[PDB]
Each structure stands twice: as structure tokens, then as C-alpha cells.
Ligand binder design. Sequence first.
Ligand code: ATP
Ligand code: ATP
Ligand code: ATP
Ligand code: K
Ligand code: K
Ligand code: K
Ligand code: MG
Ligand code: MG
Ligand code: MG
Lengths: 524, 524, 524
Amino acid sequence: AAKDVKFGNDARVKMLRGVNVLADAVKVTLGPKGRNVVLDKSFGAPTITKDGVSVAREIELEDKFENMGAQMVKEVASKANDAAGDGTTTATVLAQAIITEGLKAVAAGMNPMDLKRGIDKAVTAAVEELKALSVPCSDSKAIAQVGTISANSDETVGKLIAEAMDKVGKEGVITVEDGTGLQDELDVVEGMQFDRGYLSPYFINKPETGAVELESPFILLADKKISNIREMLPVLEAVAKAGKPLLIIAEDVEGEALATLVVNTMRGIVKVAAVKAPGFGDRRKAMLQDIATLTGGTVISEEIGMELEKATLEDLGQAKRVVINKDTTTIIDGVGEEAAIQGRVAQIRQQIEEATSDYDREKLQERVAKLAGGVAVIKVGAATEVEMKEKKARVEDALHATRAAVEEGVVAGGGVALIRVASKLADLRGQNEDQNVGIKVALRAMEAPLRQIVLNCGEEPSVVANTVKGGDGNYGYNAATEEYGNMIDMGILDPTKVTRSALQYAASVAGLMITTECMVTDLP
Amino acid sequence: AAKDVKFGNDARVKMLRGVNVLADAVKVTLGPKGRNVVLDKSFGAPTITKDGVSVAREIELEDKFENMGAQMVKEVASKANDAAGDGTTTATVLAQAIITEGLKAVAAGMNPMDLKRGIDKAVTAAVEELKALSVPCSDSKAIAQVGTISANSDETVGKLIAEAMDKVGKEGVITVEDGTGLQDELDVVEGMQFDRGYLSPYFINKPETGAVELESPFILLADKKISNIREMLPVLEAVAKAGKPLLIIAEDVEGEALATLVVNTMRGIVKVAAVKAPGFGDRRKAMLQDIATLTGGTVISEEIGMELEKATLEDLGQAKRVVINKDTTTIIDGVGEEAAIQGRVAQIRQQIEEATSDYDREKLQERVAKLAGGVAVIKVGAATEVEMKEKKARVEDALHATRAAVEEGVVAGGGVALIRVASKLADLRGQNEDQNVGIKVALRAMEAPLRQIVLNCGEEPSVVANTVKGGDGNYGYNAATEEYGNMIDMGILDPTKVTRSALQYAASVAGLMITTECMVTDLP
Amino acid sequence: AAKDVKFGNDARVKMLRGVNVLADAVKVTLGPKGRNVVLDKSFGAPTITKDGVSVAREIELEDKFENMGAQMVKEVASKANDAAGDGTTTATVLAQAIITEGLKAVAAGMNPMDLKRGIDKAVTAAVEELKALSVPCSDSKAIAQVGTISANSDETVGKLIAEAMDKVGKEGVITVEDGTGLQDELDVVEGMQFDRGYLSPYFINKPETGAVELESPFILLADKKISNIREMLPVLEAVAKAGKPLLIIAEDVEGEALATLVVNTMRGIVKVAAVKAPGFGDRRKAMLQDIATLTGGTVISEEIGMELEKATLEDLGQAKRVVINKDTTTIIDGVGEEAAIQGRVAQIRQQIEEATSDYDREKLQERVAKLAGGVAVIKVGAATEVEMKEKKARVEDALHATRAAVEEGVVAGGGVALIRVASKLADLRGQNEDQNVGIKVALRAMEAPLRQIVLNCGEEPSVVANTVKGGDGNYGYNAATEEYGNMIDMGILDPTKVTRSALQYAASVAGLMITTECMVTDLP
Ligand SMILES: Nc1ncnc2c1ncn2[C@@H]1O[C@H](COP(=O)(O)OP(=O)(O)OP(=O)(O)O)[C@@H](O)[C@H]1O
Ligand SMILES: Nc1ncnc2c1ncn2[C@@H]1O[C@H](COP(=O)(O)OP(=O)(O)OP(=O)(O)O)[C@@H](O)[C@H]1O
Ligand SMILES: Nc1ncnc2c1ncn2[C@@H]1O[C@H](COP(=O)(O)OP(=O)(O)OP(=O)(O)O)[C@@H](O)[C@H]1O
Ligand SMILES: [K+]
Ligand SMILES: [K+]
Ligand SMILES: [K+]
Ligand SMILES: [Mg+2]
Ligand SMILES: [Mg+2]
Ligand SMILES: [Mg+2]
């Protein structure tokens, strides 16, 4: 089809318009006094959000040029959320400021490519200064403060998140979800707990709970479908002679074998709980070997060279307690070597490092968390459901900030460390005065976050930012409190990863955003 | 698609317009003198209702922003009906009042999120004051009065409701349904009566009713398909020797054994009634175990490890009387261990507490009702159908309010206890003057329900509400009578649960409603 | 979708407009001088009708709100036809008058629900007065008069209807159909006559009519398929030895068996007429048992414990005469126990009592009428097809009125007994002046039927109704004769059921029609 092309300043005007629209929509939610953006939903009820990339990803314009400029500027918030999951509004504001200043420099009749070169130089130096200005955040206090700041000044959320990684450990998994009531809560799970309920309620030794519990159980790890008691005659006779409970973690147990086993349960012969092997296929064998490592047993497999009729007490993994309910089979203290546990989680972490999909690395990380540490779950509560969504989003922003602050540390919060960094780079010069103008573009843009945070509080971002710049280090502006002081002190803490990724993506977008000369869309 | 985005006071104006439209439609039905609304039906004749959430759920606007604002405000009535099933119009009125006052506060150029914090603080205190002001409603008189008030001043409805729980007991089930004549009706059923008619009319011992009746029956509980009489030669010989009637509650009886048994019936060998096991699968096993508990029998199964040919008189459950008609089989006074019934319904109640779906907990509650107490049914009568719908809806609203009043007690009805509670909180102050103004928003909005109830009666809500506030406690306005006095005494009873849930949901919506800054919807 | 909402007096005006349109279309057919309405048929020629509910059910309005009110007011005529099948125009007129007067009362600013309460009170009293004013219509004279008035002053129709129940008896069934020529026809059928012609023409003992007739027939009631003579060797040998004609009422007789039987018919061995068992399944067994009761025979079925090869003369039911033609098999005077006939029809009437569908009770009443009484048919003859339609509908209205008058009696015709009833209620007062005004609304609306009937006759409904009210009892206005005088004596009779149901449904609709405040409908 015939295309629609804008050359020269017109293309830049469309770009600035789209970028400004998207950034104006995003930035109203920045800072502790940022407000919420109500998003209509064609299906169901509208949502209420204060997240930056959430607002950014919903922005499209009817003007094709402005729309696709907004499409290119949405990448800043999208990638900032992708990296750190927080500070997306700061990324959008910084990108818009860099783009505007660089376009103004282009409007002076000078090379945009050297503007991009200088912008990249200055922002690289600024990211370095942010990383060097990083102060570690590994104490649950500062972690809770970081989560607070990214939960829109919510101390309870950051506190609960710090308690969550405290309960689960560093190698454990922390999850934020909804609770049923109006209040949030945290639960941590240690050892193995896999959602494989008993394959028959007749195994239930505690009908008041509808659950099976086995003590010092024999965990027959069968990477096979358990069918005929003739397969289990040697092993189940050996277990009845042993008398201790046997736990079935296999592909399944058939109806006739299940009938024999259940009958024997109230015949008193064998106290067996039949459940399935967690995972499916490769992950099924992964869980099977995981349980074997925890319980010191062997996975009954056929291609390796043994049979179920060859299985005896030794092939049976051994645990201390295995609680089976209608859904979960919790191997509590699998009686087996820890050494195979660390070796398994080591191969698992090697897989994580070789896992490109976040899904793969996360599944393997959860394999570690079950096998090595624990699993913690945060439930969040609210009376209504828009409150549910907003509070859960804030709690997960807090989670992202807490983890990133554990990762890289923190800096002076509220866009103040960026002001310090910009003060640290007022001297940088590129290859030509054009690259120097690009550096000045970046430097002028670096003070936008605090100014926008303060503007969301309704002060003078000019006067307030000036007073903040008057002090240095962590001296800033407590935007929620409307005061100046050490941003680290009162707990205005932002992860260095958050700000660094935001700045990097903002500059990387703005560098090519400035150098646009020919812009083509389709005809409307 | 290109979106339609709004900022500033325009967003709040659109929110307020949609919310006001929805609440104005809702509140014409509040109070004893509330009027009805005809809802047109594209299919069939239009309907007439005085319910609040029913009117609320039908409201949508052509204006996208106002329409979706109505979408978020409809949540108040929807959730109030979900929790309490009554007082939904009061919830809508309270939500609209809080929203309007908080938006007015925002219009003063002041912080909305602190308004939300103060509103939540004041409303939590108000819910506490309401619950502390709860007076118990467990006697049939106060139940009748609650049903009266929530059936639009209909004493017959609340009376029938109190009589219903009196007949069925508290663990029993009460249902409001349609009657054929011009009048309401109440029926209670004891024991199990399960809709499993005789599998053959030749079993009918009373053809004048076309029904089978067995006395001291042998209840063969066989969770298996009867396939040949050869399966029943042990039990049928044992019963012909016993001579007492045998009742079959099995999976089914095949046609050949059915023919043999029917022949034996007029051959006089065994007095047979063949019916099926109520439920299907797991619920079928549940019903079979229930019948076994009451009748002192055992469900014939093969996984447990025994055959029907192995069954004898003992495996046949025993009752006092079992009446089988073309549809139902009523095990009247199953002669068997009650203790197993209470243990069974205890496991059933454990399931109820572990039943998240209302369907699951309700099925298990009915299992309790049949096994422990009884089952009650309320009918309703009318000449035409719009009358039928309006009356039955009033009866069910009254049922919901009576049960909520049994649960949490009652308070001063007609928007009066809310006035007392608001008077109890005139002092509360939040974190800042912003939260204080939010608390005052909540306090000012708390008194709206009396105003709307009085206005639906056509008085001066100002002067009448002032006179109501002049007295306290249960002194208020008898809106139907258009007089002042004790709300509790004059039969003006509203459940504390109803008002508490209404207030909670109204405030929880209004809190984020106030903090709205931007709207994003599709372009029209 | 975006809704169209009407509040207050706009909604009331739209309701009244729809009601008025529907009632104006209906009432032109009221009285002996009601005028006919051509209803266009998109397929075929339009019809000409003087029926009230027939005109009412065709009313559709483009205005959603007027159409809404019209749909709610159509219920009056629909339910009046549903209950009594007659006097539907009177129901529509009464409902319109009550609605108009109640809307006028509400337009005075007074409480609508109390108006509904008073209207219901007054109409309940009026229905009681109508029932107390009922004078029996059981003799053929008053039946003919009721039919005449409800056949729009057609004595032939009511006469034929009285003759119809005279020929068929009260337990019998009267049916009105159209005839072939220009004259109506009445036919009565007694005993058994089921449309099961001979299975083969070689059974025909009278080729001049193509019919089979058996004298003292042996009725083989086989609830089974009859296949091979080897099944019938005992039966047919027993018949040939008995020499009596053998009538087979079974599922069928197979082609080889039929060929052998037909051969034997002109071989002189057995005079067999093979016909099928009337009904299908349960109703087939019901017909078989009815014939067994009438003919003193036994139904051959396997599940009781006998076989066709076990059948002999005793299992062969016995009749006096069975006339079989190409279609029907008429067991005329089945010689057998009448006691089982009355017991069976008593069970069938029991089934009527727990028959929910009108089809169920109709089937069962026809079973009784065949087995106990008779069956009657009324034809409708005329030169053309529109005359078919009009005459048949008129005759069936007359039939409905005659039966309802046999049921509850009659009252003064032409809306005069209603005038007397309203004169008997001029004092009723409700709980408040609002209920009193509702009662007065009902009383004022009560005189509408006579006034509209007279207006259809072209007199002064004012002066005429005033003169009617001046006299009392049966003194009224002979609308057809344009004269005053006794309604009962000169043959103006209407069922008390018709008027009572009409008034009840009119008030039941109008009660909620008055109290509505608001409308909800889709946008046009
Ligand atoms: N009490 C406070 N005083 C000063 N600055 C604060 C305060 N609380 C938060 N901030 C700053 O404001 C921002 C927090 O706002 P918000 O959490 O809504 O957005 P974000 O962290 O930039 O992005 P995201 O939408 O991805 O979570 C951060 O830049 C933080 O440093
Ligand atoms: N006779 C009365 N005197 C005073 N207040 C009354 C009287 N009857 C009802 N009320 C009050 O008016 C309201 C009853 O109105 P209505 O029953 O139509 O709606 P609701 O209870 O708010 O909600 P729902 O539509 O869910 O049933 C309640 O707030 C009740 O306390
Ligand atoms: N000769 C008459 N004198 C007085 N009133 C009469 C006379 N004939 C009929 N009526 C009255 O007119 C009505 C009968 O007319 P018509 O059969 O057309 O209407 P309907 O009975 O209301 O309607 P439908 O049979 O369609 O339900 C009755 O109210 C009857 O009392
Ligand atoms: K944000
Ligand atoms: K209401
Ligand atoms: K008519
Ligand atoms: Mg944040
Ligand atoms: Mg109510
Ligand atoms: Mg008639």
C-alpha cells in the first residue's frame, strides 16, 4: 500500500508528541504521592493502578506517526520492568527528557549522531556512578524500606517481604498472591511438598482430615507405571516383613493393585500411601531423582537395568514423615544423603545458568528451593477486588525492589542519587561539541526523576530540586514528608539495579530516537 | 486501538456522573416506602422489582467513562448482595455518598490517597461500632421482624421464615420456591428422602398412589450394578427366610433381575423395592455411606474386597419404614447407629470448611440436614407472574436478612444505627488533616441511608434526620409509619452483618475511587 | 448495552399509553355488538376475529416503554384465556380501567403501594361477591344460553354444546372442529374405538366397506411383538377349537404370521382380525390394560411371568363386537368386569390429580371417557375459510363458557353482575386513605365491562349504566336488544369462573403496574 512519510522536523514533532503523551500518562503515578490511573476494561470492571510500565503498555494514539513513536518509547518502561520490575516510571521520564533535549539540540541545526554518541557516553558514566553510589541493602530493615518505597510507602509490605526471604532463605522461592480476607499473610514450606494426593481414600489413616500419613516411609521411586502386585510381591513382602509404611511415588498404581493395597491397609499387612511421581516426563524423572537424593533411595527405571520385581527395601527411598492429603504429599525430612541434595541442586543451578527461558531457570530454582531450602508464599488480602489488584501490584513492585536491592544495593531514593550522579558528570565532553551537547542533553535529563516525584507532591520541583542539589550525597527530598534530608536515613531506598536499568534503557532508546530524519508509516 | 484518555477533574466528573446515575437508579427502592422499577426484558414480559443490587446490575451508560465508573461502583451492591443478600441499596447509597464527599474534598486541591486512608480508618471504626451495636436476633419474633423489614414490611414472610428454621432446625436447609396457588407454603422433610423411585411398578404395594412401601426394610447398599439374580441368591434367600421387605439402594437393578424380583413380589417370595443410589460417583458413595450410617448397613463395594454374593442380611441396611413412590424413596427412621451419622456429618462439615465453592459446602450442608436434622421448603403464591417474582424476591431477601440477623444480630433499622455509629466517631482524626478530611467524608456519608429511606417516604430527610439524631440508640424514624421511636421495638430490624458488609464494600470501593487521576478507555 | 431509563411520571405515561393501546384494540370485540378485527397474515389471507385475547396477543409497539407496558398488560387477557378461556376482553377492559384510575391516584401524589394493597383488598372482596352471586348453570338450557352469549348471541352453538355434553356425559370429552359443508355437526362415540385398523385386507369380512368385524371376539392383549405362529399355536388352536373370532391387539403381527392368519381366514380355520395396540409404551400398556379391564382379559407381557405360548382363551380378552376398518378398531361392548373399568379410570383420574401438564390430564381424562363414558365431537361448517375460523373460535369460546358455567354457575351478564358486586363494596376501606383510594379505584373500574359492552352497541354507557345501576340483581342492559331487564331470564349468561378469573388477573397485574417508579430498557 502507499505509505505515509514525514521528513525532517515533522517526523521529530510527531515523535515528540507521541513520547510526551506516553510519558505524561506514565509519570502521574511516580513518587510516594503519585496518583492512580483508572484503566477501563472492555470485559469486566476497570482496573486501578499506580504502576508505571502498566500505564505505559496501554498507550496508543490514532495518529500513526505519534502512535509508532509512542510504540518506540514504550520500550523504555517495558525493558525497565523486564530487568528490575520497578522504577519504570523513572525510566519513562528519563527517556522523555533525553529525547526532548536531544531533539532540541537537533533543532539547533547540528548532528544527531554525535548527540547519540555523547548521550551514550554520559549515560554510561552515569550508570557507573550509580553503581559506585550503590549502598548494599541486605538487612531486612533496608530491604523492608526498599519494598516500602516501591509499594508506595507501605512499610507492612516491605516488612512482610523481608520476613518472607528470611523464612524461605536466599535459595528459596518467594511468591506474592491474593488471600481470601482483607489482610496479607505469609506461609513458608520446607522440604518436599508435591501435589500428589493419595490414589485411594482407603489409605487415609486420619479421616478427620481425609489424609494419609506415613512414618519412616518406604519411598518406592518407580519411573514406571506400577500395575500388578506380582511386580510388588518381593518388595511388598519385604515391606510387610519390615512392617514400616511404604510410600508410592511412581507414575501410578492400577485399580487392582490399588484394591489389593487398600484392602491390606485395613487388613494391617502394609500401610501404603499410593501417590504419583511429581513432574511429567523429563521433569518427572527430575522430581523422582530429587526425591531419591533427599530420601537416599533409587529411582526404579528400566533402561538402566532393573525391575520392580527386582526392587527391595534398598531401592525404596526412606523418609522420616510423609504426609499425604487429598492433594499434597509432603516428604518431611527424607532420610537420605544431603550430599546428593547439594550435588543435585548444583547440576540444577548449572541448568539454570544454561536455562535461557525464565520458566526453565525458575523451575530449576524451585527444584533447588524444595531440595535445598524452602518455599514461601505471600498471600495478600483486600475487601474488594480493585483494591486486591492495586495492593497486590504494589506488593510485587515491593518484591522486585527488595530483591534488586539485595542484589545490587540501594542509593539515595526519590530521584536524588541521580541528581548527585549528574553533578558528578558536569564535565564530560565527547568527540566534538556535538557530542558535548549530547552529554549536556543527558545531564539535563538526569534530574527529571526527583523533579517529577516532587511535582506529584505539588511542590516547586525547581526550588525543591535546587535545595536538594544544595546538599549532596543522600541529602534529598522526602517527597511523602515534603522535607529534605538523607534519603537513606528515613528509608527512601531504591535498588541500584532499578535505576541503572531504567537509565540504560532510556538512553539506548533516546540515542536512535534523536537521529531520526526519515520516518515512514502507512496511509491512514 | 487508539484509546480515550482523560486527566484531572474531567476523570472525577465522569466517575461521579456514572456513580450518581447508578445510585439514583438503585435508591428509589430503599426503605419500606421504596417504589418498584420495571426492568424491560427483550424476551418475555418486563419484570418488576424492589431489590437494590438487582437494579444496580442492570445499569450501563453509553458514555464510556461514565459507564465504566458505573462498572466500578456496581461492585458495592454486587458484593453487598454476595455477602449478606440484603441491604444492597444501603450499600449503594453509602458508596455514592462517600465517593461524592471525597471527590469534593479532592476538588479542594488536596491529597486523595490520604483521604482514602482516613476513609478506611473511619469506616473500620464504624464497622466496629455497628458490630458492637449488634443486638442478637435469634428468637422467631425478631426473625419475623427482620423478614418483615427486608420483605418490604411483610410480617407473613418473616413469620414463615422463622417457622421454617423452627421446623427444619438450624443445621437443616430452608428454600424459598414457587407455589401453584395464590399463597405461600412451608414444608419440612425429615430423614433422607432421595428422588430414587421404584425401578418397577410391579413393586408397588399401594397402586392407589402408585408407590412402594417397605416396613423394616433390608437396605442392600450396593455401589455396583446388579447384573444377575445369581449375585442375590445369598441375600434374597436370606431375606425370603427373613421375610422382611428388601429395599435395593444400588447403582441399579438389571431388567432380568428386575423381572425376577417383580415376579417374586406377586409370587409373594420377597417384598422387593428396587431403587437407585442417590448421587453419582463420589456423591453417590457419600449418599450410600449416609444411608448406611442411618440404617446400620454397609455400602457393598469391591475395592474394599468383598462381593455381592458374599453379602448377607447384615450388609443389608435396616430401616423402620421406607416409602418409595414413582420419584422419591424416603428412608423414614433408618434403624441404625446415629453416632456414625454425626461422625459422617462431622467429616461433612470438615468438607464444608474446606469447601470453597458455595455449591460444595451447600451439598455437604444438605447432607448434614438429611442425616442430622431435616429439610424445609418455602413456597410462594401469586395470581400473575410479576407479582410472583416481586413477592418471591422479597421473601428471599427477607430470608437472607433473617439468617444474617441470626448470625450477627440486628441493630437499629432504617438508617438509624448508622446515625448512632457516625455520632460515635465524630472525633476520629487520621495521620494528616488530609486523613482527617477523609474521616469526615466517611462520617458525613454515613448518615445517608436514613435520608434516602425517609425521602422514599416523602418526608424532610433534613428535619426528620435531625429529629432522629436528637434521640439516640434505637430512637429513629419509623419510615413506613412516618414516626420517631425505637427501631428495635417497632419491628424495624436490620442485620448487623448486612450493614457491616454494605459499609465495608462501599468504603473499599470509594477509597480507590477518590484517588482516581486518569481514565483510559477505547475511543468511541 | 447502553440502557434507556425512564423515571417518574414519564414512565407512568408510557405505561398508560401502552395499556390504553392494547385495551382499545381489544375492547372493540366486547359484547354481542363487538366489532371484528382483520389481523393480517404475512402468509395466507388474514383472519377475522371477535375474540379478546386473540386480539390482545398480537399487540406490539415500537416504543419500548409503551411496548413494555403493553406486554405487562397483555398478561391479563392471556391469563384470563388460560384460566377460563372466555371473557378475556372483559379482563383487559377491567385491567385498563384499574391501571388508569390507580395512575390517576398516584398522579395526585399519594402512596402507590398502599393503592395496590387497597386495590387487592377491594378486588378480593369483589371476587367473593361474584362467587356468592354465582347462579348454577348445569341444565342444557342455561348451558345453551351461556354458549349463545359467548358465541356472540348464537343459540345454535350453545344448544349444540349442551347436546354434546348430553350425548357424551360429563366424564366424556367434547371437541369442536371444523366440518366439510356449510353446517356444524355433533358426533358422540361410546366404548372402545382406537385407530388401529386391520393389519391385512384379507381379514376384511366386508369388502363393500373394507372393514373387519368380529363377534364375541377373543382379544389377545399381547404387550409384545407377535412374530411366529409357533408362538400362537396354543392360542390359535384354542381359538379354532373355540371357533370364536380372534382379535389381536398387540404391538404387531409379523408378515409370516399375518400371511398364515389371513390364509386361515378364507381357509375357514380362524376368523382373525390383527390390529395394533393403541398407544406407545406406557400409554400403549395403559390402553392394553383399559381393554383388559373392559373385556375381562389379561395383558400378555413377559415380566409378570407368562408368555404368548402360555396364553389361552382366558388371556384372550372377550368382547361382544369389535368393528375394525382400514383405520379404527372399535371394541363395542367388551364383555368383561366393569369394576376393573372404574378402578382403572379411578387410577387414571388420580394420575390427572398429579398430572401437571394439561396434556397429561387430557390424555388421562380421555382414557376415562373411553373406558367409562364416551367421546363427543363438534364440527364447524360454512361456505368459506375465514368463516371456518370465526365460527370455530366462537363455538370454542362458547364451549369454554358453558363448561365454566357448569363448573361455577353463572351471574348477571353484560357486566351487570359486576355492577351489583361493586355496589356491594362501596364501603370498603383499607389501612389508610391510600388503601381506601385504591379500593375506590377498583370500585370505579368495576363498572367498565357493561359500559364498554353498551358502547360497542352504540348507546350512552353513562345513561345506560346509570339505569342499570338504578335496578339491581339481574336488572341490567340487554346489549344486543338495547333494552334493560333481567340478565338471567332472557338468556344473557356468563360463567362466574370467567368473570372471577378476569377480575383476579386484572387486579394482580394492575397492583404492581401502579406502584412502579422507574423503567430500564435498551436504547432504541
Ligand atoms: N517517601 C518517599 N520520599 C521520596 N521519594 C520517594 C518516596 N517514596 C518513593 N519515592 C520515590 O518515588 C518513586 C516511587 O514511585 P512508584 O513506586 O510509584 O514508581 P517507580 O518505583 O518509579 O516505578 P514502578 O511503577 O515500576 O514501581 C521512586 O523513584 C522512589 O525513589
Ligand atoms: N418500617 C420501617 N421503618 C423504618 N425503616 C424501615 C422500615 N422498613 C424498612 N426500613 C429500612 O429501609 C430499608 C429497607 O429497604 P429495602 O428492604 O427495600 O432494601 P434493603 O434492605 O436496603 O436492600 P435489599 O434490596 O438488598 O433487600 C432498610 O434500611 C431498613 O432498615
Ligand atoms: N345480549 C347481550 N346482552 C348483554 N350483555 C351481553 C350480551 N351478549 C353478550 N354480552 C356480554 O358481552 C360479553 C360477551 O361478548 P364477547 O364474547 O364478544 O366477549 P368476551 O366474553 O369478553 O370475550 P372472549 O369470548 O373473547 O373471551 C360478556 O361480558 C357478556 O356478558
Ligand atoms: K509508578
Ligand atoms: K431496596
Ligand atoms: K370478545
Ligand atoms: Mg517502585
Ligand atoms: Mg432488605
Ligand atoms: Mg364467551
